[PDB]
Amino acid sequence: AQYEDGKQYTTLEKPVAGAPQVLEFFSFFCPLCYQFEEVLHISDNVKKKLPEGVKMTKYHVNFMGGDLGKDLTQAWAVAMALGVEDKVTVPLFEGVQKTQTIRSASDIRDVFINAGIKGEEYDAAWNSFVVKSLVAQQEKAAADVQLRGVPAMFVNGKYQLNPQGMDTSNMDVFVQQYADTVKYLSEK
Amino acid sequence: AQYEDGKQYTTLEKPVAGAPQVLEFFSFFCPLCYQFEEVLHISDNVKKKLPEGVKMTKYHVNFMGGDLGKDLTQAWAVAMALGVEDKVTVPLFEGVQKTQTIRSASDIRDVFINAGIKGEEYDAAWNSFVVKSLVAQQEKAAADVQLRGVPAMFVNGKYQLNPQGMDTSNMDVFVQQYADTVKYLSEK
Numbered sequence A, B: 001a002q003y004e005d006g007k008q009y010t011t012l013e014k015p016v017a018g019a020p021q022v023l024e025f026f027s028f029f030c031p032l033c034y035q036f037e038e039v040l041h042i043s044d045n046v047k048k049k050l051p052e053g054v055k056m057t058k059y060h061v062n063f064m065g066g067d068l069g070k071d072l073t074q075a076w077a078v079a080m081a082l083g084v085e086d087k088v089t090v091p092l093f094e095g096v097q098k099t100q101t102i103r104s105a106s107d108i109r110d111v112f113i114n115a116g117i118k119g120e121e122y123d124a125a126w127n128s129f130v131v132k133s134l135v136a137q138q139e140k141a142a143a144d145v146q147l148r149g150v151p152a153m154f155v156n157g158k159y160q161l162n163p164q165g166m167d168t169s170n171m172d173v174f175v176q177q178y179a180d181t182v183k184y185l186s187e188k
Helices: A031-040 A042-047 A066-082 A085-097 A105-114 A119-127 A129-144 A171-186 B031-040 B042-047 B066-082 B085-098 B105-114 B119-126 B129-144 B171-186
Strands: A009-011 A022-026 A056-060 A152-155 A159-161 B009-011 B022-026 B056-060 B152-155 B159-161
Touching (some): A022 A129, A031 A085, A031 A171, A042 A171, A056 A129, A066 A119, A085 B031, A159 A171, B031 B085, B042 B056, B085 B105, B119 B129, B152 B171
Antiparallel strands (some): A009 A159, A022 A152, B009 B159, B152 B159
């Protein structure tokens, strides 16, 4: 075939029911995740090729960055609850990997405040139970697929993208090959 | 300051003979490298405190950015061969990470042409023996020190700077501590 199991994607031995249509996992400490987001813009390009209605979910993971890793998963939950993902993704990635100015939960908070989120608004969300359940959903989703590495992307809780089976000479071609595979899998 | 093995620097288990006095590794895809170069000016500050007769060598790595990473390593060789390092370093960092106008080998050529290098000259340099030699040199150098990641700097092939063991609190103090550590190690 043109799309082979084991080449551009892998089929999960134990499929997951009730999983979001397109689920992406990442970590602000993950180098390749930085490339995918800031340079390649994977998520955006994938979104612009998905059929009408198909929803995309992006979750943060706990297994990198120790203590800060967990703080970031909670911060991501806050970003989701408040709907400010598009305002804090870049400064969080850069804060951790470019300028190395993010070293504690306090530093994470500064980013949100700088990005325009009010202090009291951030603190309320940070301590909310709505955020606590969001953290739990992120953890459960990772558990359902036995995730042990990022970046990762699953389609219909059954297939996992395999970017190792794609050409990386030209970045634009790589991105489109990636996006087309997600489209193919979503209607499969 | 007080310099201690395991703290501000590390001693190599297996020393590399013939290594440049001050060897620095980076990648145009590396975020912190971009920071070191344009904001901190780490290299400049290190040069400003190096003794008489001390030369700095800077090499590019392959393990980042897939196949384009290899092309950038060859383009860096061309920059060294033509002696235009100071003219193209920032434009290449911006093209890859900021403006994102560099997506394939062809886009790199444009950077050089825009800086004043004739296309014929760039193309001739690109396929030259001097360049193929420089590319091999950069690859061997990384292999010899078993480079895990970048940015990285080695002194006299025996010591490796450990910025993680340095005072990150104040960037101005950090920069000078980094430079002083290099100076201290060069005469040891």
